[PDB]
């Protein structure tokens, strides 16, 4: 992954002009600094290994953290998945138009004691769930429901002090690549929603105490980190400028190209 | 000489007689679809010389307090012959376009415009809540233009067209990374972009999805002195390249 | 039972770690791939297209595309300056912004050559020279013609090839340099100025613009990726 | 980071006010900034909004006439004039920076403008 | 414009206490609770139908959908004894609700 190296040069005086160039034909100048001036020969041995789409993108992000409350009634959490709520994975995943890879998926759960009133509260370790429903599948509604048998919905149990859960998930998807941005609609009639909306199909993620309330409130809190793996990336676009605004499109208010200095010629 | 060009289409010709080199695409040339690649299981249409030929879009004009057009690709041609007539009986397409934009100007003149073809062009509304609706997205071959002032958010359902964010959110010096070409009014007269079928599907529906924007942005403003003529129009042409399409249905 | 013994870093998440965890969607057929055009394998070469540089930043001219073009008129003194920015790709915002400069925010150490291509937009009937310079540190800024002579320097002919390459190279003690404002790697300054006039005939206007170019060579290289400044969240987007 | 107002004002009945908001702790031009109006017996009440960047302000159908919005970069101030004055203009004004869609997540600590003679 | 109907309530403290505000038409849960201290400060608290801020106790909740929402506060302390606007942000131009004051109950 190594970078060109030098090579030396000499006094020319000829017909060749590798400075002028023409920048109106779309094209960029291969030039090097032994065409311009006298250089001499160095070898390089610098690599370009970390800036590649892998070593780039294969780090774990947060991407939302809920709360559920032990003994409340609507007090279990739910999340439809997607990257589209925090500011910095976001702007990394759309400098690119497509993508594909697997996915690597951890949880952090921590809980906090509530105000009660009763004496001498002692609790013992809590487990907690956590369902993935694909979308089409039924969808729990209170704490003890049915739907949490987890039959064939995929569930992980996890008891409080451990390692944290991790698992791995495939590249699931309907067509050859994630999109980042859709031009067009749903309907064929051109109406209601516009935008990355219409292609959102993966699923919602369920969260719930299995342990009962014994004395004293619990609030706990699962934050979920993305991480992708075996990252392929196609047609790049320039950064993002304007501050995010919503999840569901990319509308913006404007802003000045860069910050402003007080003459073109003060360094 | 490499200022001269020639590109025979069906029974349409376009010749240039200064330019400069044409781009074509990320590396790659149109070609019709694989076997290994393909999903539908029906024999596609592949009509090739009564729809891979030149259409001409309307023209515009080049003022001097001017910011930029746009147009949304698979629907300029939406009522252009029998491109427009397939694209209504059938249910899937795609399609490889050639640009051709052309603005000619004497040796007094001076401008430059920056000819841009970018993929997913999403634009934004001028009302935070909201998403624009079709007409203000596109019109068939006529071009929407950007402003060089901010649109309210009293506005409902409208484009945000300030010119330097280039309606998508990002910085307008930046749109060098789509394949793209200067008209240099000093130099060049005419702009030539080939671009291969860039989706993340092998075929797409061609009225409820664009997958190409054309973006034509002045950097340097159109300037003259007294006398010069103060005309200075801009048009531009486009020719479908290997096309095809599946799922024939009711006319829509 | 075989006997083991386990070592600190047991049961910890380090973010940026390799290791290998069970399925949860056992026997999965992904889809098949597709020949799309445009992949990118390293981001160094996303950093090697050129783009537009911001010269013109006098805080009424940034909310416009005034920003990016260079006044040049018809003198009557010789010698005067046209810009000049420090050379700070990461740091000094005229390179903050561009195609080169937002993937050096990601990244801390930086290491190799520039180019910068400027091109004449003017009239066909137009001339002109250019002293395009570039000046080490250890001084101050070249006040003068006759101090930025003194650097790497080219003069440029105007005519019918209308761009022009100043490649400032690799002069450093370090072999990297760092991306935020370091005093002890400051890396110098890139000024312009009037060799002749610019002579226009009559009936042809005597302003002209100048675009300018930024992109990297092929002995480019980042190091250290971090997190961008630029991006900012205070509540979810919803 | 926090918004800090300027002193309590009074004026005549037809003169005019001027407030200001010296925003500190954040980049100034990247966030606008919006002002609120509070009379002493109902609710808030939303006047407009000046993007710092590229100076364009947009107001409320019924603080068009009347108020008028500035800035600059140099001192990260924002400005609010008040004119023709009259006995309703008499209330509390809060500074606002608008978040991420549309929440206001730090505000102002208030000036007191009343008209008298 | 939307009407941002909501005037003065009373609770013990330990108590819970219930807030609502009514909006005239669908806003689609983009509603967000402010809370404006004795002295004149304002800070947020609820910054969607349910979703809290950071930096704010667990005493807060919100719920609702459509037209009908609410705030609840199951323990009254003597800090929570302030003014309590509803902010919708849906249309142009943002509608702020009435106040509601808290007291002591005797």
């Known amino acids: 992954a190594r970078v060109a190296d030098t090579i030396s040069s000499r006094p020319t005086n000829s017909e060749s002009i590798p400075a002028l160039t023409a920048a109106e034909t779309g094209h960029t100048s291969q030039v090097v600094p032994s065409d311009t001036m006298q250089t001499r020969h160095v070898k390089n041995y610098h690599s370009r290994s970390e800036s590649s789409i892998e070593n780039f993108l294969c780090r774990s992000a947060c991407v939302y953290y809920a709360t559920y409350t032990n003994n409340s009634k609507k007090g279990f959490a739910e999340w439809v998945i997607n990257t589209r709520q925090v500011a910095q994975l976001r702007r990394k995943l759309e400098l690119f138009t497509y993508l594909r890879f697997d996915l690597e998926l951890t949880f952090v759960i921590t809980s906090a004691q509530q105000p009660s009133t009763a004496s001498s509260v002692d609790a013992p370790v809590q487990t907690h769930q956590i369902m993935y429903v694909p979308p089409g599948g039924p969808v729990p509604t209170k704490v003890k429901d049915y739907a949490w048998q987890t039959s064939t919905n995929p569930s992980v149990f996890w008891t409080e002090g451990n390692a944290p859960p991790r698992m791995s998930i495939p590249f699931i998807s309907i067509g050859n690549a994630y999109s980042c941005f859709y031009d067009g609609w749903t309907q064929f009639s051109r109406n209601g929603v516009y935008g990355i909306n219409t292609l959102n199909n993966m699923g919602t993620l369920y969260m719930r105490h299995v342990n009962e309330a014994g004395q004293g409130p619990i609030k706990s809190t699962v934050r979920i980190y993305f991480k992708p793996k075996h990252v392929k990336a196609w047609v790049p676009r320039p950064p993002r400028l304007c501050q995010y605004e919503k999840q569901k499109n990319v509308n913006f208010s404007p802003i000045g190209v860069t910050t402003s200095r007080t003459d073109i010629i003060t360094t | 000489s490499d200022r001269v060009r020639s590109i025979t289409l069906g029974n349409s010709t376009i010749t240039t007689q200064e330019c400069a080199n044409v781009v074509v695409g990320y590396g790659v040339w149109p070609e019709y679809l694989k076997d290994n690649e393909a999903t539908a299981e029906d024999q596609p249409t592949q009509p090739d010389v009564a729809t891979c030929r030149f259409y001409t879009l309307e023209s515009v004009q080049w003022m001097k307090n001017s910011a930029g057009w746009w147009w949304k690709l698979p629907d300029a041609l939406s009522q252009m012959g029998l491109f427009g007539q397939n694209m209504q009986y059938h249910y899937l397409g795609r399609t490889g376009y050639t640009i051709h934009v052309q603005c000619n100007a004497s040796k007094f003149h001076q401008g430059c415009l920056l000819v841009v073809c970018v993929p997913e062009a999403e634009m934004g509304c001028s009302n935070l809540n909201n998403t624009p609706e079709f007409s203000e997205l596109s019109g068939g071959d006529s071009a929407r233009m950007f402003t060089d002032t901010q649109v309210g958010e009293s506005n409902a359902k409208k484009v945000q067209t300030a010119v330097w964010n280039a309606g998508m959110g990002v910085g307008v010096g930046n749109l060098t990374i789509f394949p793209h070409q200067w008209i240099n009014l000093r130099t060049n007269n005419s702009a030539t972009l080939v671009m291969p079928y860039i989706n993340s599907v092998p075929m797409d529906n061609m009225f409820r999805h664009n997958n190409l924007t054309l973006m034509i942005i002045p950097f340097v403003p159109l300037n003259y002195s007294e006398g010069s003529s103060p005309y200075v129009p801009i048009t531009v042409t486009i020719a479908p390249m290997c096309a095809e399409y599946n799922g024939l249905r009711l006319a829509s | 039972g075989l006997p083991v013994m386990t070592t600190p870093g047991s049961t910890q998440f380090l973010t940026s770690d390799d290791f290998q965890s069970p399925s949860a969607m056992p026997q999965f057929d992904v889809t098949p791939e597709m020949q799309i055009p445009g992949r990118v394998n390293n981001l160094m070469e996303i950093a090697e297209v050129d783009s537009v540089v911001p010269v013109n930043n006098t805080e009424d001219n940034v909310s416009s595309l005034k920003a990016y073009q260079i006044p040049v008129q018809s003198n009557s003194d010789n010698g005067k300056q046209v810009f000049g920015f420090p050379l700070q790709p990461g740091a000094n915002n005229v390179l903050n912004r561009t195609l080169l400069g937002e993937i050096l925010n990601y990244y801390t150490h930086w290491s190799g050559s520039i180019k910068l291509t400027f091109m004449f937009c003017g009239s066909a009937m137009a001339t002109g020279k250019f002293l395009l310079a570039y000046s080490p540190p250890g001084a101050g800024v070249p006040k003068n013609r006759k101090d930025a002579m003194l650097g790497t320097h080219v003069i440029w002919d105007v005519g019918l090839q209308s761009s022009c390459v100043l490649c400032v190279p690799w002069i450093s003690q370090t072999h990297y340099r760092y991306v935020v404002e370091d005093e002890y790697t400051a890396a110098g300054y890139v000024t312009c100025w009037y060799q002749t006039n610019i002579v226009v005939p009559a009936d042809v206007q005597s302003s002209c613009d100048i675009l300018c170019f930024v992109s990297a060579c092929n002995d480019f290289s980042v190091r250290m990726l971090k997190d961008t400044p630029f991006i900012r969240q205070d509540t979810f987007y919803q | 980071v926090q918004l800090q107002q300027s002193a309590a004002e009074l004026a005549r009945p037809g003169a005019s006010v001027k407030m200001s908001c010296k925003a500190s702790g954040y980049t100034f031009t990247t966030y606008t900034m919006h002002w609120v109006k509070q009379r002493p017996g109902q609710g808030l009440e939303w006047i407009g909004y000046?993007?710092?960047?590229?100076?364009?302000?947009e107001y409320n159908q019924k603080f068009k006439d009347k108020t008028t919005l500035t800035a600059d970069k140099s001192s990260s101030t924002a400005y609010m004039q008040l004119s023709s004055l009259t006995f309703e203009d008499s209330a509390v004004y809060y500074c606002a920076r608008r978040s991420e869609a549309d929440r206001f997540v730090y505000w102002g600590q208030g000036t007191l403008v009343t008209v008298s003679a | 414009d939307i009407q941002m109907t909501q005037s003065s309530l009373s609770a013990s403290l330990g108590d819970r206490v219930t807030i609502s505000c009514r909006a005239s038409?669908?806003?689609?849960?983009?509603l967000n609770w402010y809370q404006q201290k004795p002295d004149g400060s304002v800070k947020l608290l609820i910054y969607?139908?349910?979703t809290l801020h950071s930096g704010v106790p667990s005493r807060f909740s919100g719920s609702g959908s459509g037209t009908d929402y609410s705030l609840t506060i199951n323990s009254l302390e003597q800090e929570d004894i302030a003014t309590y606007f509803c902010?919708?942000?849906?249309?142009?131009?943002?509608?702020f609700g009435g106040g509601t004051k808290l007291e002591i109950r005797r």
């Open positions: 969607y139908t349910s």
């Open positions: 000046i993007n710092p960047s590229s100076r364009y302000t």
């Open positions: 038409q669908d806003i689609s849960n983009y």
């Open positions: 902010q919708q942000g849906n249309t142009f131009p943002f509608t």
